[PDB]
Design a protein around this ligand. Structure first.
Ligand SMILES: CCCCCCCCCCCCCCCCCC(=O)OC[C@H](CO[C@@H]1O[C@H](CO[C@H]2O[C@H](CO)[C@H](O)[C@H](O)[C@H]2O)[C@H](O)[C@H](O)[C@H]1O)OC(=O)CCCCCCCCCCCCCCCCC
Ligand code: CLA
Ligand code: CLA
Ligand code: CLA
Ligand code: CLA
Ligand code: CLA
Ligand code: CLA
Ligand code: CLA
Ligand code: CLA
Ligand SMILES: CC1=C(/C=C/C(C)=C/C=C\C(C)=C\C=C\C=C(C)\C=C\C=C(C)\C=C\C2=C(C)CCCC2(C)C)C(C)(C)CCC1
Ligand code: SF4
Ligand SMILES: [Ca+2]
Lengths: 63, 144, 74, 39, 74, 165, 80, 733
């Protein structure tokens, strides 16, 4: 139950991330004590062609 | 598992020779020796150019750099599904086992391996170069 | 299509028939421009009472070598 | 016919038709109004 | 490029030309044997001297070539 | 007048240039017949040259020492000496057509951005939507001013990605 | 020698180790991710700096970084 | 094993390849990257390097003076400086054949010599030099000064003479002494020389060290200065019939502000220059008492910076913390110094061609062209360096924690807007300037020159009218006889200035037309694009979306690999690298415009430029093809003349430029594989394998390749244009 709801839209707060200040869909949130449990999928790929990434609880905000 | 020992009296694959082999570095600095076991005689491509025939059983080869040995290892593992291993040989006769270092390939996790050069932070948490300035030499903020 | 276009240009927008009677003085030409934005200056006086762009592909000499004497054949 | 119209709606075909239309309009304007320098 | 440059200079210097009374006058006057042995000769007698026709072609039927001559430099 | 220039209707170099152009055209025409295609084309070019020179002189253009027309870009001088047709009116005309194109393109992007595959609409142009937006773009300045006044023209800083500085 | 560093954003996908052409990286046990593995660089003296590991990393930003340092016979990939 | 060279880098000394020598040569002055370097040691090394640089400069000046005094014709040039060409130095070359020997033997010398184009003859003649003895004494004096500076550099490194780090950071004291002493006192001393030597020597009176204590600069002898009757020093100036170097028509004034130029030398009055240096000397000395050092009075620059923040918060924190980020960063100071010096160098070029200060300088067309081109190219290189050091400051010395909310942090906060607007301005200027040029070219090609777009530069002509030019007919400010600005200067400097600006035979505010408008827009495009590349590289130096941690890799690194789509030329060094090409292109456009306008002016046909500068074909044919005929004819199959050296230099520059294209197009990998094959060939060759290399042969690095290609490009560019400009201007006149 920790973290954002699955399927919701969040804004990335990681400064070095390609999707900084961008909206992405929440895929899954790990229930353990991992550093980056939130899984976010994006519509636009980065320079490496990846569309998903892992972020911490404080690195994503419900937007 | 125990570290293997190089057998200098090991047959080499059937090759007619080429101009991309060893140079003076092998006689003055170091060279590399790769050994593997083949289930049958098969034609493979030499990393230095050309086609050689690996014999049934033990096979030994010499290369000038470690990249050639690992390229041959990748070719033998992905195509013929073999398990090769190589060493670094010095002119004095010293032999140093290189890969797989712990007997298990590095792509799969193995117990007993101690992590090295691991930063318990992310890239964005690196300090600015001004805090690293006037050090012993040119140092990047990731080195601290 | 390209060859057919070359033959069509030599048959409708050229001076091949006039060049046949004087190949040593008339300059071969097989391209004419439309009188727009002052580009009509490109239609130079190639000879034979014709105005156009002097071509250098050598189609006139090739057609003369093949025995072509009229625009109907082209 | 639907697939053909979709093919005609692609970027190169649309760009070709649009540029041909724009170029034709400018050429016809310069033809009926030769040498326009000032308004 | 060096091949076509050599062909153009050699043909215009020792082959192509008009025929007069007891003598043949070439386009460049036979200056290849005396000026093609230096880079300065190729730059002055072949590139600088022969480019006059394309730079002063404006206002004539060959002006388009001059335009392309500038466009190609772009 | 302005900048020491003289009107083209009184410049001697202007008339001299017109005579030079007509002279070279007539010289080229002297080698043809009187009822042939090159003769008719050369006569048409001569008439076009005469009409162009008369129209440029009638427009009130200013000619320099070279006899060529000179344009006035300053709005004050252009509006004070009747030269607004050179650089002022064409300026606003270009601004209208350029803003027209930009507004139509922006409207198309905003319209297709809310679909399932906007990239597909970007490579395969939706002709009916593009035609409708192209026709509706005639009121682009009024619509743009209204969008700017309502605050919907720009995007917030928090919704735009930036580098880590 | 070049400097190869691993960061905590690593997901343990082992793609960087498989892409290394000189056996510089390896996998060690870890507890900070679902894969329970972490990349490591215990043989940086053999690194040439090809940056294939960075090309194979899927995290944003990268979890493995290669900083070109001092040059030697091994780092320059010289067979002579 | 470990080599001794380089001693400052242990990592480079352990490199067994040829890259060690190249990197040791290119990282010798990067003291911040040396092993075991501290801040105090850094400042001390820079101090010693500064002294060595001054020693080199003074030795170079003494060398020029010595060669002009020995192998020159200064004693004959002062007698007839209109029809006698200056001599740089003699030529001693065993490769010269007989025709080259009589070809270079000119200017009245007894052997082959070089005709100087630096203008030191006019400068030395104006300041007072008349004989070879004076140049010899000046050369010996400058050599002694150079030796003293070199000894000072060596002495400030030994113990009991090394300055502490606190002494190097005394910004208030340094600024006060530089404004009052280095600037004000030096200008006052120069005024003393002009009043005591230059002015009396221009009036036929010899004043040297043997009689300057018994010769009065003015007949009233310091009485008007102490009594406040300073206007007595402006009474009886040089008339319009004064002959330079003689007493015919000479006056008695020493401080005037007549304005304009001398009727014979076509240069600024010596009394006006003396008065100028006196006024700026007083101003600089007064400005040298602004900062607080040790007497309570004065300012603290930190207080002025901290008390300069707008109340509404438009600039955020304002300039808080800017004193520490500037005083503790040498790259910030170097960037500011280079930006100001580059702008001043450009100012020198413009003012020197428009207002010639040295006697008989305007008649020397080759000297004017060479000086303008030289200073503009130097200014462009210095400007590129200023921006490069700004990028180095952002990477190595910028601290976001200390510069929090100030203007410096706010610049990076909206760097995308700055780069985007620079891109828009450059795009607009390029599209329109190129479009107008191609339109004019098509109109000229189709035989309709009256159809080309010729926009009159009414704004610049309006400014020219404001300065007094009545050609355009605006009739306002100095152009109107009934204005307050005009009537307030009719008794001090407006007569001479108006007479000089209304003369169309000089370079003082030349007449401009549509061609000048178009080329000015081309110059604007060049400036904006070079600024865009440099500014974008400085702002993206700390990182971007493609490389979020670019600051962790330093200022110069090859790339980040082919991953993430490819990262070639991503560092700030590469941005400066691409900007050097744009700088060369911009300076090429400005020098092309200057040379063509002045060539048509000197030839007496300005209509040629006015009618051919509106289209690019006129630039290529009437300026480049037409003016290079004498240049390429320096040596031909029929013989050679004195202009053959410029033809050889022309081809030399073309070859260097083309050689640079090799390092610019082909990259490392191909060359490394080729070198490996060469290594095998040498190792397998008998009678040659007995000789082995000490450093392993490797191809040049990516960064080194870029630097080498750019160096060849710039050298070929400079040499080619210098040879063409000097040959065309000297052969035509
Ligand atoms: C008259 C005065 C001059 C006379 C010259 C006379 C003769 C010519 C002399 C030398 C010829 C060139 C020799 C050097 C070639 C380049 C080699 C090189 O190492 O090249 C690379 C160097 C070194 O780069 C450094 O390389 C370093 C390498 O470090 C690596 O290695 C280090 C040591 O082990 C550390 O381990 C470190 O961790 C590791 O990363 C770092 O990356 C640094 O960040 C990086 O700055 O870069 C650089 O370019 C450094 C050079 C800066 C030049 C800046 C100006 C450029 C101007 C161009 C336009 C010229 C126009 C001329 C006009 C003429 C008109 C007539
Ligand atoms: C294959 C080479 C070739 C080339 C390079 C040219 C070039 C030229 N021709 Mg020619 N021609 C050719 C072949 C060629 N032709 C052939 C094979 C024929 C016999 C059928 C002709 C018959 C012909 C005639 C009768 C005339 C020319 C003319 C011209 C000139 C005017 C250009 C023009 O098309 O205006 C017109 C431009 C347009 C109509 C714009 C077309 C743009 C369309 C809309 C793009 C659509 C894209 C679409 C996907 C592709 C079309 C597919 C469709 C056909 C199914 C020009 C220099 C004219 C001339 O010489 O003037 C004196 C002229 O009257 N040509
Ligand atoms: C940005 C640079 C630029 C600019 C400002 C111009 C401007 C102009 N060009 Mg030119 N040209 C350029 C670049 C440029 N050109 C280049 C690069 C080339 C080489 C391809 C040419 C080649 C060229 C030629 C060959 C000719 C021109 C001509 C003209 C004039 C035609 C005006 C017109 O079309 O009638 C008016 C246009 C309209 C009324 C369309 C309005 C749009 C809609 C329908 C109305 C909406 C308005 C509200 C005009 C002053 C012609 C001329 O006569 O010169 C004087 C002509 O002969 N140009
Ligand atoms: C893009 C930059 C630009 C530049 C460099 C100029 C430059 C100039 N403008 Mg101008 N102008 C511009 C944009 C620009 N304008 C724009 C965008 C507009 C539309 C609002 C105008 C509208 C305009 C007018 C109506 C007038 C000028 C005038 C002038 C000229 C003198 C006035 C002046 O310098 O003050 C800057 C210009 C202004 C602040 C606009 C107001 C005009 C001021 C108040 C001066 C007018 C008083 C009087 C007419 C001065 C001339 C006295 C006598 C010779 C008649 C000068 C060369 C004057 C002129 O010479 O008339 C022919 C004139 O009356 N401009
Ligand atoms: C919807 C179309 C559109 C719009 C509204 C804009 C708007 C803008 N662009 Mg841009 N651009 C576009 C397309 C567009 N662009 C395309 C296709 C390219 C690739 C060639 C670029 C490349 C580009 C660059 C490199 C730059 C801009 C910049 C800018 C800004 C400055 C004004 C300008 O005109 O610059 C100039 C723009 C161009 C020269 C390209 C315009 C291309 C055409 C005219 C647009 C037509 C698009 C499409 C085919 C029409 C819609 C079809 C639809 C109905 C189906 C401005 C907000 C500048 C900036 O960064 O802002 C400060 C700048 O540096 N643009
Ligand atoms: C009145 C005392 C005084 C004086 C005369 C100087 C003088 C100088 N100091 Mg120093 N300094 C002083 C006090 C003083 N300092 C104090 C008190 C401190 C401690 C706070 C320092 C700390 C200090 C440091 C740390 C450094 C210097 C340096 C320098 C040298 C600068 C080199 C230079 O740029 O050339 C001279 C510059 C000019 C003459 C000004 C030129 C004006 C413009 C730019 C040109 C325009 C002039 C004209 C148009 C061109 C001439 C035309 C023709 C002749 C060609 C210079 C000789 C540097 C050095 O060490 O060099 C060895 C340096 O690193 N000083
Ligand atoms: C007051 C002026 C000044 C000063 C003190 C500095 C000082 C410094 N600069 Mg800098 N710079 C300047 C101006 C200045 N620069 C200018 C004007 C430019 C534009 C050209 C640059 C562009 C620049 C860049 C891009 C870089 C520096 C770097 C550096 C730092 C160390 C590099 C070094 O010098 O090693 C030694 C320098 C060399 C060995 C130069 C190589 C030789 C050059 C190419 C001259 C070749 C000419 C050629 C031989 C002519 C032959 C022709 C003939 C044979 C026919 C150092 C602190 C580097 C740095 O900070 O490191 C990260 C850096 O990368 N500078
Ligand atoms: C003649 C060579 C040339 C040209 C034309 C350019 C042009 C340009 N450079 Mg560039 N540059 C060059 C050489 C050149 N460079 C070299 C040798 C270097 C060193 C490597 C650089 C390095 C460099 C850098 C680092 C940068 C630029 C930038 C720019 C752009 C500046 C914006 C502008 O002026 O808008 C005007 C646009 C043009 C002049 C392009 C020409 C437009 C054409 C002619 C019109 C289209 C023709 C026709 C309609 C269609 C034909 C297509 C056909 C196939 C059908 C511009 C496109 C800067 C930039 O990107 O700005 C945002 C940038 O940062 N340049
Ligand atoms: C004019 C510029 C230029 C020059 C001089 C060269 C020169 C050379 N290129 Mg090259 N190239 C260039 C442009 C140039 N390239 C460009 C722009 C590209 C990019 C497309 C390339 C791409 C390229 C490739 C891919 C290759 C070369 C290769 C070579 C070498 C061929 C060997 C040879 O010719 O023997 C002799 C050398 C010369 C004729 C050069 C001039 C030497 C002069 C005449 C001798 C002067 C000696 C003098 C006494 C020195 C005293 C100096 C004094 C201060 C002491 C040669 C050194 C090939 C190679 O590696 O070699 C096998 C090779 O594979 N080039
Ligand atoms: C990157 C960087 C940087 C920066 C740099 C720069 C900034 C450059 C530039 C630039 C420049 C180069 C500038 C300049 C300028 C100028 C100005 C700003 C001016 C002016 C003017 C005026 C004000 C005038 C007036 C007048 C007139 C108009 C005329 C008559 C006289 C008078 C006076 C009246 C640094 C290093 C810091 C550091 C950080 C980073
Ligand atoms: S590729 Fe990246 S995420 Fe995968 S194991 Fe290597 S460092 Fe970790
Ligand atoms: Ca004396």
């Amino acid at each position: 139950e920790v973290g954002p709801k699955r399927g919701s839209l969040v804004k990335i707060l990681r400064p070095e991330s390609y999707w900084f200040n961008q909206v992405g869909k929440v895929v899954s949130v790990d229930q353990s004590g991992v550093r980056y449990p939130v899984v976010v999928r994006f519509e636009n790929q980065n320079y490496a062609g990846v569309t998903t990434n892992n972020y911490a609880l404080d690195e994503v905000v419900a937007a | 598992w125990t570290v293997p020992t190089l057998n200098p009296d090991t047959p080499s694959p059937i090759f007619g020779g080429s101009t991309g082999g060893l140079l003076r570095k092998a006689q003055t600095e170091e060279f590399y020796v790769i050994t593997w076991e083949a289930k049958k005689e098969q034609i493979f491509e030499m990393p230095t150019g050309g086609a050689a025939i690996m014999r049934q059983g033990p096979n030994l080869l010499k290369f000038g750099k470690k990249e050639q040995c690992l390229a041959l290892t990748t070719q033998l593992r992905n195509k013929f599904k073999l398990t090769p291993c190589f060493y670094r040989v010095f002119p004095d006769g010293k032999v140093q086992y290189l890969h797989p270092a712990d007997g298990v390939y590095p792509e799969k996790v193995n117990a007993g391996r101690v992590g090295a050069n691991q930063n318990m932070r992310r890239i964005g948490q690196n300090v600015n170069p001004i805090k690293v300035k006037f050090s012993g030499r040119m140092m990047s903020p990731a080195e601290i | 299509i390209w060859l057919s276009g070359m033959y069509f240009h030599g048959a409708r927008f050229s001076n091949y028939e006039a060049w046949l009677s004087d190949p040593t003085h008339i300059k071969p030409s097989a391209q004419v421009v439309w009188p727009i934005v002052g580009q009509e200056i490109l239609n130079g006086d190639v000879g034979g009472g014709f105005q156009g762009i002097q071509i250098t592909s050598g189609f006139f000499q090739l057609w003369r070598a093949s025995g072509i004497t009229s625009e109907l054949q082209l | 016919m639907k697939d053909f119209t979709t093919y005609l709606s692609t970027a190169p075909v649309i760009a070709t038709i649009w540029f041909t239309f724009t170029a034709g309009l400018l050429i016809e304007i310069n033809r009926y109004f030769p040498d326009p320098l000032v308004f | 490029s060096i091949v076509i440059f050599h062909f153009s200079w050699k043909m215009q210097s020792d082959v192509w030309g008009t025929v007069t009374a007891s003598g043949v006058s070439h386009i460049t006057g036979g200056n290849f044997a005396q000026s093609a042995n230096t880079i300065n000769g190729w730059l002055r007698d072949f590139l600088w001297a022969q480019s006059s026709q394309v730079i002063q072609s404006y206002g004539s039927a060959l002006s388009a070539y001059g335009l392309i001559f500038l466009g190609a430099h772009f | 007048d302005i900048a020491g220039l003289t009107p083209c209707s009184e410049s001697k170099a202007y008339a001299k240039l017109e005579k030079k152009e007509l002279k070279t055209l007539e010289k080229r025409l002297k080698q043809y017949e009187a009822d042939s295609a090159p003769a008719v084309a050369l006569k048409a070019t001569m008439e076009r040259t005469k009409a162009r020179f008369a129209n440029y002189a009638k427009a009130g253009l200013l000619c320099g020492n070279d006899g060529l027309p000179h344009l006035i870009a300053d709005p004050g001088l252009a509006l004070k000496y009747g030269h607004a047709g050179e650089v002022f009116i064409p300026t606003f005309g270009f601004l209208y057509v350029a803003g027209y194109i930009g507004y139509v393109g922006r409207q198309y992007l905003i319209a297709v951005k809310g679909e399932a595959k906007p990239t597909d609409k970007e490579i395969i142009i939706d002709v009916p939507l593009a035609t409708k937006l192209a026709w509706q773009g005639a009121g682009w300045p009024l619509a743009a001013v209204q969008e700017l006044q309502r605050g919907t023209l720009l995007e917030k800083e928090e919704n735009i990605t930036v580098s880590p500085r | 020698a070049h400097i190869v560093k691993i960061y905590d954003t690593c997901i343990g996908c082992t793609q960087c180790v498989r892409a290394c052409p000189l056996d510089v990286l390896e996998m060690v046990p870890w507890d900070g991710c679902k894969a329970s593995q972490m990349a490591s660089a215990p043989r940086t003296e053999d690194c040439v700096g090809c940056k294939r590991c960075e090309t194979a990393c899927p995290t944003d930003f990268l979890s493995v970084r290669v900083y070109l340092g001092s040059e030697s016979t091994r780092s320059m990939g010289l067979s002579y | 094993a470990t080599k001794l060279f380089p001693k400052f880098s242990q990592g480079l000394a352990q490199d067994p390849t040829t890259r060690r020598i190249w990197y040791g040569l290119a990282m010798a002055h990067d003291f911040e990257s040396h092993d075991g370097m501290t801040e105090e040691n850094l400042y001390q090394k820079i101090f010693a390097s500064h002294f060595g640089q001054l020693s080199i400069i003074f030795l170079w000046t003494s060398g020029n003076l010595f060669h002009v005094a020995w192998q020159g014709n200064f004693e004959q040039w002062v007698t007839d400086p209109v029809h006698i060409r200056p001599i740089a130095h003699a030529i001693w070359d065993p490769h010269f054949g007989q025709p080259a020997v009589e070809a270079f033997t000119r200017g009245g010398a007894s052997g082959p010599v070089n005709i100087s184009t630096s203008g030191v003859y006019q400068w030395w003649y104006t300041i007072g030099m008349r004989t070879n003895q004076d140049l010899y004494v000046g050369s010996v004096f400058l050599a002694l000064v150079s030796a003293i500076f070199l000894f000072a550099g060596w002495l400030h490194l030994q113990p009991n003479f090394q300055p502490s780090l606190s002494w190097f950071k005394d910004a208030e004291s340094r600024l006060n002494h530089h404004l009052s002493g280095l600037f004000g006192v030096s200008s006052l001393a120069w005024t003393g020389h002009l009043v005591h030597v230059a002015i009396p020597e221009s009036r036929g009176q010899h004043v040297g060290w043997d009689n300057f204590l018994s010769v009065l600069p003015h007949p009233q002898g310091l009485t008007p200065f102490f009594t406040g009757n300073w206007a007595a020093y402006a009474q009886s100036p040089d008339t319009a019939s004064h002959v330079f170097g003689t007493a015919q028509g000479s006056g008695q004034a020493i401080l005037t502000f007549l304005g304009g130029f001398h009727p014979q030398t076509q240069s600024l009055w010596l009394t006006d220059m003396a008065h100028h240096h006196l006024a700026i000397a007083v101003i600089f000395i007064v400005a040298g008492h602004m900062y607080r050092t040790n007497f309570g009075i004065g300012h603290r620059m930190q207080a002025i910076l901290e008390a300069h923040t707008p109340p509404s918060g438009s600039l955020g924190a304002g300039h808080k913390g800017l004193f520490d980020t500037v005083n503790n960063s040498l790259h910030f100071q170097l960037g500011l110094a280079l930006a100001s010096v580059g702008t001043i160098t450009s100012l020198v070029a413009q003012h020197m061609y428009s207002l010639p200060p040295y006697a008989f300088q305007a008649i020397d067309f080759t000297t004017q062209a060479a000086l303008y081109t030289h200073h503009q190219y130097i200014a462009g290189f210095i400007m590129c360096g200023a921006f490069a050091h700004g990028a180095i400051f952002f990477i190595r010395d910028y601290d976001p924690e200390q510069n929090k909310g100030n203007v410096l942090a706010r610049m990076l906060d909206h760097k995308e807007a700055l780069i985007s607007h620079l891109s828009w301005v450059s795009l607009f200027l390029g599209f329109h300037t190129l479009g107008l040029y191609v339109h004019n070219d098509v109109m000229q090609a189709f035989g309709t020159p009256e159809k080309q777009i010729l926009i009159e530069p009414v704004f610049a002509q309006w400014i020219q009218a404001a300065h007094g030019k009545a050609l355009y007919g605006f009739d306002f400010l100095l152009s109107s006889k009934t204005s307050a600005a005009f009537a307030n200067g009719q008794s001090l400097w407006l007569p001479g200035w108006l007479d000089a600006i209304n003369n169309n035979q000089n370079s003082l505010f030349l007449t401009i037309g549509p061609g000048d408008f178009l080329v000015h827009h081309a110059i604007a495009l060049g400036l904006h694009t070079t600024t865009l590349i440099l500014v974008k590289g400085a702002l993206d130096a700390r990182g971007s979306k493609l490389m979020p941690d670019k600051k962790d890799f330093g200022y110069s690194f090859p790339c980040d690999g082919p991953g993430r789509g490819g990262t070639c030329d991503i560092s700030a060094y590469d941005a400066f690298y691409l900007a050097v090409f744009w700088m060369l292109n911009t300076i090429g456009w400005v020098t092309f415009y200057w040379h063509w306008k002045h060539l048509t002016l000197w030839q007496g046909n300005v209509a040629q430029f006015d009618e051919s500068s509106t289209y690019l074909m006129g630039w290529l044919r009437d300026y480049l093809w037409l003016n290079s005929s004498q240049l390429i004819n320096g040596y031909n199959p029929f013989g050679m003349n004195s202009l053959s050296v410029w033809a050889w230099t022309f081809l030399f520059g073309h070859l260097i430029y083309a050689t640079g294209f090799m390092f610019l197009i082909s990259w490392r990998g191909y060359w490394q594989e080729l070198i490996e094959t060469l290594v095998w060939a040498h190792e397998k060759t008998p009678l040659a394998n007995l000789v082995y290399w000490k450093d392993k042969p490797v191809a040049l690095s990516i960064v080194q390749a870029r630097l080498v290609g750019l160096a060849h490009f710039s050298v070929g560019y400079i040499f080619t244009y210098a040879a063409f400009l000097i040959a065309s201007t000297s052969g035509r006149f």
